[PDB]
Each structure stands twice: as C-alpha cells, then as structure tokens.
Design an enzyme around this catalytic site. Structure first.
Site, PDB file in Angstrom:
ATOM      1  N   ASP A   1       0.822  -1.199   0.000  1.00 51.03           N
ATOM      2  CA  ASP A   1       0.000   0.000   0.000  1.00 51.03           C
ATOM      3  C   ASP A   1       0.863   1.259   0.000  1.00 51.03           C
ATOM      4  O   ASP A   1       0.709   2.086  -0.898  1.00 51.03           O
ATOM      5  CB  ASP A   1      -1.012  -0.008   1.147  1.00 51.03           C
ATOM      6  CG  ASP A   1      -2.051  -1.114   1.049  1.00 51.03           C
ATOM      7  OD1 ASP A   1      -1.836  -2.083   0.256  1.00 51.03           O
ATOM      8  OD2 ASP A   1      -3.055  -1.022   1.791  1.00 51.03           O
TER       9      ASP A   1
ATOM     10  N   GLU B   1      -1.219 -10.249  10.696  1.00 44.78           N
ATOM     11  CA  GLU B   1      -1.096  -9.677   9.363  1.00 44.78           C
ATOM     12  C   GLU B   1       0.368  -9.373   9.055  1.00 44.78           C
ATOM     13  O   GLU B   1       0.791  -9.429   7.902  1.00 44.78           O
ATOM     14  CB  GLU B   1      -1.931  -8.391   9.317  1.00 44.78           C
ATOM     15  CG  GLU B   1      -2.178  -7.858   7.910  1.00 44.78           C
ATOM     16  CD  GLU B   1      -3.042  -6.601   7.824  1.00 44.78           C
ATOM     17  OE1 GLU B   1      -3.681  -6.263   8.828  1.00 44.78           O
ATOM     18  OE2 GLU B   1      -3.068  -5.964   6.738  1.00 44.78           O
TER      19      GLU B   1
END
Ligand SMILES: O=[N+]([O-])c1cc(-c2ccnc(N3CCOCC3)n2)ccc1NCCCCCCN1C[C@H](O)[C@@H](O)[C@H](O)[C@H]1CO
Length: 765
Positions: free
Chosen positions: A538, A735
C-alpha cells in the site's frame, strides 16, 4: 472423462460451512438457496441480550479467540470458539455425508460449555436461523404436538429445484431448560424450544440479526399491550423467548434457552440419498473425518527439522485449518465504475487530482450478479476475495487438494470481463457490502493487482509433468483431465496478460530512455501521492511526486512471471505461435529489467521516474521492491546482480531482522514513517517468496549455493519461529510482525497468507 471429474467435484464441494463472515452457518454453492446461521448470547437482564448476542465474526476484548481446529471442505471439520463476554467455550462440528443427486447431506453438532468464570446458572439464548431464497421453493416447520412449543426435535421439510426434497432437523439437545413459574407461562408455556416461520422479500433474508430482533420486539410489545409490567415482570429469558408460530415461510427461526452447558444437532437429510441422517451418523462421520484429516496432514505437511515436534504440528494444523476453513461462497452484485473516464488514463502530471474528479462523478453502478468460491484473508475484518492474496492462499491449499485449488482458480477466472480485468477486491451482494464503507466498495476496471494466481498454476504444471482421496488429485493423476483444464483456462490467462500490457503500460518512447526493448515498461495505474494500492504494497515509498513517466520494477517482474507461465502452458498445449511471442517478450523483460531498473551505485533494482529535466531517474528505496526480479524467479543462479541482492537480503543494517526480512530498510529515509504499513514490518507473503527462491539457489550448482543455503536455513527458522511464538502467546496469526520486537501487529486472524508458514515448515520446494 474431464466432464465426469467435473460433475464429481461439483457434487463433492457443493455443501460447506461456506459463510466464513459469521461464526457458524452453512450454504451450498448456489446463489439463491438454503442458508443457515448460528446465534448465541447470555441474558442476565432485560436489555443485555442485544449487546451479548453473537452472529457475524469480530475480534475485540470480549472474544479470546476462535478458529478451525481441523477442516477439509469435502468432509467438514471442527471449530472452537472462546467467548469471554458470554463465558462460553463452544465447539461446532460439521460433517458431510455423500449420497443422492443433490450434493449429499450434512450434520452439525453445536456444543457449549460454560467456562470457570461464568455463573453456573447462566441463561444462554441459542438461535438456529434458516432461510431460503428462490421463487418456486418451499420450506415448512412441522408443528409440535405440544401447546406452546417443542418438547422434542424441530423438523423442517423443504423443496427446491436445486436441492430436490430435503429435511433439516434441529434436535432436542441436552442441557437444562429453565422453567418460569410466572403467570405468562399460561399463555407462552413455562419454557420450551420455539419456532417462528416467516416470509420477507428474498433479498433481505441475510439480515438475520435485524429479523430476529424485530420478532423479539413484537413479543415485548405484546407483553406491554397485555398488562405484563414492572410490578411483576416475567424473567428476562422468558421475555426474550419468542411465541411459537411454526408454518410455511422463507425464514425459520428456531430458538432454545439453556441453563448451564448445552448441545444440540442439526441434521440435513437429502431425500434423494435414501435413509435420513441421524445423530449417530454425525458422531461416526465426525470421528472418521478427524482420522482422515490426521493422515493427510502427516503426508502433505510433513514438517522438517527443526519443526518436527508435536508443538509445531499443532501449530501447523491450526494455521492450515484456519486458511482452508476460511473458504466461502459469495453471490451478488458488485459496484463498478464503468465510465472509463479519460482521467483514468493518468497520462498527465497531477493525474491523481484528475482521477479524483472523475470518481466524484459517481458513475459507478451495481452489476452482476457474480459468484465466487474463494479463501479469504480475514474472517473478522475483510471476509472476502482479494486477487493477489488468493495466489498465496492456494499455495498450501493446492498441496492439500489440487482439484480444490483449481476449482478456486476457475472461480476467479470466471469473473474476468471482456477486456481481461478481474476486480482485485470482490464485494458480492448486500451481505458482503454490509461490512464495507460505500466509499470503498467501488471497483475500477483500470486497477490491477499482482497475478499471484499464476504461481499456483506453475506448481500445478510441474505436478502435471512429474473417493474424496481420489478426487483431490484427479486433475494431476489423469493427465488428459489436467491438460483440458489448462486448454479452457489458457485463453483467459492470455487475455489477462494482454490486458496488463494494454492497461498498465509504461512510457519508454516519449522520454530520453534507452533500452534493449522499446516495448517492455510498466507502471501500476491508480497511485495517489502516498499510496500504490494496486501493487499490494500500500504505502511502500514510490517516486515523488507520482508521474506518468514512472516505471515500477515489481510490476515488470510480475509480467515476467506471467509470460514464463504462458511459455509453460502454451508449450503443453502446442501453441507454437504464442510460445515464440512469449519467448521474445521474456528475453526483452530480462534486458529491460537491467536497462531501466538496475542501480549499479545502489546494488539493487529501483523503480524509475522522470526528472524535472525530463530525464530518466532511478528512485531507490531498499526493501521488498528492490528484490523483485529475485523474488519472482527471473534471475539466473550465476547472476552477479543476484549476489548483490543476497548481500542486501542478509545485511542486518538494511533488511535482515531476527524476525524475518523488513519490508523497508532501516537506512531508508521512509523507515517507520506515516502509517508504516509496508515501511518496516515483516510480511510473511514476501518472506515466503524469498525463502522459496533462496532454497532454489541453495539446491543447485553455482557461486551462491552456500550463501543461499545459509540464508534459507536462517530465514525459514526466523519466519517460522516468529509466527509460532506469536501463535503460542496470543492464539493468532497476525497480518505482519514487528522487526524490533517480533510482536504480531495489525489485524489478528490473518489466515490469510500468514498461513504459508505451514508450507515453509514442510520444505522440499
Ligand atoms: O473494514 N473493516 O472491518 C476493517 C477493520 C479493521 C479493524 C482493525 C482493528 N479493529 C477494528 N475494529 C473492529 C472492526 O471494525 C472496525 C473496528 N477494525 C481494519 C481494517 C478493515 N478494513 C480494511 C480493508 C482493507 C484490507 C486490505 C488488507 N490488505 C492490505 C494489503 O496491503 C494488501 O496487500 C492486501 O491484499 C489486503 C488484503 O489482505
């Protein structure tokens, strides 16, 4: 025979607890059909149940943990749920029993045990919610003998074109049913299982919580109207016990109240299969599934040193089971901007402002319906298909059940539009949309995502070269079958390859840019000042400012992955014209990777941009991006550039932490800044690629054999131990992992590519 294997796979895979967005529910792989879901919660007052009730998955202070202890979608499995708020340890066992012509039968046992902290006389409300969508289908609760509800089992009889005749039974269960001595009991009974049978328009049947509460609210309003008041109120659990009204409808709510521990079964009997499913069948089939799971695990995921111990086995079984157990069936419309506004071409400087203006036209509209059968990253936070994630997910799943993986690949490729686009995030139907802010639902036909599904394809291909048991590997065991699957998929792969080259093209010819090939150059569409979401990384730092002249080395490397797969698959299908084109494209990417992206000064690959002076410039930010040609397997084992990459990989002051490779170097100016998503934390998916490529070089003659062997050994251990240590302490896959502290951070329940750890432990790539 391919047609035959297909039918057998459809029959095998049709039923599942394929609603991973909720703690426990089932649906078949049919868009408009029969679905079930479980709700439970303690009730201690007149207003608490609305707050304690559980339905959709979450993760907060009130939930210790939950997940699949064992799972295979062809067989079923066992899930355990640790609920602190409700002081309950719950187990849901689900099992499939093949037979008939409608995808077989299934059963579930729901068991709840109070934990040590709960009041021993806790009242727990339990609801089994059943709905059916379809125009000419029917479902009916057979009424009870008794006046106020059910002393025994609840039997639903139903029919649809998809399922034929069937019965679904919710057994009486075991546990104390509280009894009320209140006057109300003369009209509502002392306390018993009740059923309400209702109908709503099909498209809202998924809204189980609101539908239940509206019924509860009608019950309470009835109490008020009929003079039940605070002078002498019925107990809470009776105030919240629905008036029994079974019948015909497309919604059936089955409610039980228990005091202390409880269990009950759900038995789904497909009429076309002969004798109906019993609780005894359930217990036997559950025992059988575990034994079969155990045996396949030991064979498929044979953990190598130093992870051979039982602790690691249990860890591995947990990581794997949560990954494959997240498989869902999703159905519905998606939100897509089909304007192809010209601002989306991003051809000018400042293109992000133009693109923003186009998005503010809000031309997006619902389209479909689509279906998808896929594993997911996150039950509690984003229980839905993500394109590049799924490539990682299927790497272990393919080991387990190649036919299943191919089934999921096919499902994804069936979404591809005429141009070669698959939306990178699949939000299918109102139920899926409910978990997503509307600003973030819209998909854009110019947004790509890494083609990691090709990696799965590559594993399948090497396997092709070199009853549920049999079905799981049919497409490799029967080479005719395997090849036919490729024949049918091959054009879509080719379409996607072409789509990348048309839509994600970069610009060589327009600038002072010298390179071996005039064609091979790529730039991810969709970037904003601080982000490149389409790349998957991202906020990894990119040229500032974004610019139509950007080139992204990761994206070029992904095209290299694709073309190599196409060479393999083309070859197998004898598409000679195609293979020679691919061959020339690969050769060209190989040279242009160097000519546009290699930094001699920096000793790694860099993205490129265009200067204030209109000249080509490298913008180096040492991290995952820098290693891409190596991660994607495009470098020769003898390559001096590779040796330089190995030096960067192993350098503790740059990328190498005790816990895995850092996403960004500690030396980079952007280390640990802003949201710090991909600017330092250790991510398992990219570490997995590194591990696989180190191992490749380690098991082959060349100058870097021993170096790679040492880095493989250490990185495998570091990654595995970090994920294990965190699972041990917290019960969760995370994550990403903190490279300073080794702590899991960001979201829990990320199974999710973190689960790759099971394949890392298994080794022998
Ligand atoms: O929308 N939520 O429910 C949601 C909730 C929370 C969260 C966290 C903690 N607490 C809470 N609480 C309770 C729940 O609600 C909110 C409040 N919430 C966080 C995020 C989200 N959604 C963000 C959707 C984008 C996900 C992309 C992830 N990945 C990015 C990778 O970079 C990419 O590569 C990769 O492909 C994809 C996919 O893996």
């Amino acid at each position: 025979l391919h047609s035959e294997i297909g039918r057998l796979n459809n029959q095998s895979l049709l039923w599942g607890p394929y609603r991973p967005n909720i703690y426990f529910g089932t649906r078949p792989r049919i868009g408009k059909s029969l679905m079930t879901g479980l709700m439970w919660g303690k009730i201690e007052s007149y207003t608490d149940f609305q707050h304690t009730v559980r339905y959709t998955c979450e993760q907060n202070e009130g939930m210790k943990g939950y997940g699949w202890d064992e799972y295979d979608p062809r067989r079923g499995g066992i899930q355990s749920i640790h609920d602190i708020q409700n002081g309950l340890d719950i187990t849901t066992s689900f099992v499939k029993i093949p037979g008939g012509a409608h995808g077989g039968s299934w059963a579930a046992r729901i068991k709840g045990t109070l934990n040590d902290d709960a009041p021993k006389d806790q009242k727990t409300i339990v609801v089994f919610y059943v709905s059916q969508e379809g125009e000419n289908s029917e479902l009916e609760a057979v009424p009870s003998e008794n006046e106020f509800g059910y002393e025994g089992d609840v039997i639903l009889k139903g029919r649809s074109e998809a399922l034929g005749n069937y019965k679904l039974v919710v057994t009486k269960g075991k546990g104390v049913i509280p009894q009320s001595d209140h006057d109300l009991s003369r009209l509502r009974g002392p306390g018993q299982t009740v059923v309400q049978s209702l109908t709503y328009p099909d498209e809202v049947l998924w809204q189980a919580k609101p539908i239940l509460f509206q019924q509860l609210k009608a019950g309470i309003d009835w109490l008020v109207e009929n003079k039940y008041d605070v002078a002498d109120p019925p107990p809470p659990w009776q105030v919240y016990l629905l008036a029994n009204k079974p019948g015909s409808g497309n919604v059936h709510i089955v409610q039980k109240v228990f005091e202390g521990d409880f269990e009950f079964d759900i038995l789904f009997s497909s009429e076309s299969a002969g004798k109906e499913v019993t609780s005894k069948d359930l217990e036997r089939e559950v025992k059988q599934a575990t034994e079969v799971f155990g045996e396949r695990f030991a064979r498929v995921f044979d953990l190598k040193a130093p992870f051979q111990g039982d602790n690691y086995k249990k860890f591995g079984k947990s990581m794997f089971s949560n990954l494959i157990g997240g498989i869902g069936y999703f159905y519905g419309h998606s939100l897509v901007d089909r304007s192809y506004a010209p601002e989306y071409d991003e051809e000018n400087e400042g293109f992000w402002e133009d693109a923003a203006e186009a998005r503010a036209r809000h031309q997006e509209a619902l389209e479909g319906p689509y279906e998808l059968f896929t594993s997911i990253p996150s039950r509690p936070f984003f229980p839905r298909g993500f394109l590049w994630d799924e490539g990682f997910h299927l790497l272990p799943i393919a080991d387990w059940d190649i036919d299943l993986a191919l089934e999921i690949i096919k499902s994804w490729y069936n979404l591809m539009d005429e141009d070669g686009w698959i939306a990178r995030e699949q939000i299918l139907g109102a139920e899926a949309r409910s978990k997503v802010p509307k600003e973030f639902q819209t998909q854009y036909p110019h947004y790509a995502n890494p083609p990691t599904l090709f990696l799965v394809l590559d594993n399948f291909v090497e396997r092709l070269r070199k009853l549920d048991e049999t079905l799981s590997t049919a497409s490799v065991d029967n080479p005719e079958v395997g090849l036919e699957y490729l024949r049918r998929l091959y054009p879509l792969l080719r379409r996607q390859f072409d789509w990348f080259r048309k839509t994600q093209a970069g610009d060589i010819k327009s600038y002072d840019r010298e390179a071996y090939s005039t064609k091979e150059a790529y730039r991810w569409r969709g970037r904003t000042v601080s982000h490149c979401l389409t790349s998957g990384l991202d906020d990894y730092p990119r040229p500032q400012p974004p610019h139509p002249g950007e080139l992204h080395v990761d994206l070029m490397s992904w095209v290299g992955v694709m073309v190599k797969s196409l060479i393999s698959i083309g070859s197998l299908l004898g598409a000679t014209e195609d293979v020679e084109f691919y061959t020339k494209v690969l050769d060209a990417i190989e040279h242009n990777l160097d000519d546009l992206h290699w930094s001699e000064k920096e000793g790694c690959y860099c993205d490129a941009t265009i200067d204030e002076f209109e000249e080509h410039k490298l913008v180096c930010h040492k991290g995952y991006i820098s290693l891409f040609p190596f991660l994607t397997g495009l470098l020769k084992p003898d390559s001096p550039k590779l040796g330089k990459l190995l030096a960067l990989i192993g350098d503790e002051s740059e990328l190498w932490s005790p816990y895995g490779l850092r996403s960004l170097s500690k030396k980079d100016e952007f280390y640990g800044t802003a949201e710090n998503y991909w600017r330092s934390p250790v991510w398992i998916n990219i570490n997995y690629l590194a591990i696989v490529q180190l191992y490749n070089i380690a098991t082959q003659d060349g100058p870097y054999k021993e170096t790679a062997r040492d880095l493989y050994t250490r990185l495998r251990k570091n990654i595995v131990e970090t994920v294990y240590r965190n699972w041990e302490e917290t019960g969760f896959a995370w994550e990403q992992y903190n490279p300073e502290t080794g702590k899991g951070q960001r979201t829990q329940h990320f199974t999710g590519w973190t689960s790759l750890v099971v394949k890392i432990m298994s080794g022998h790539h």
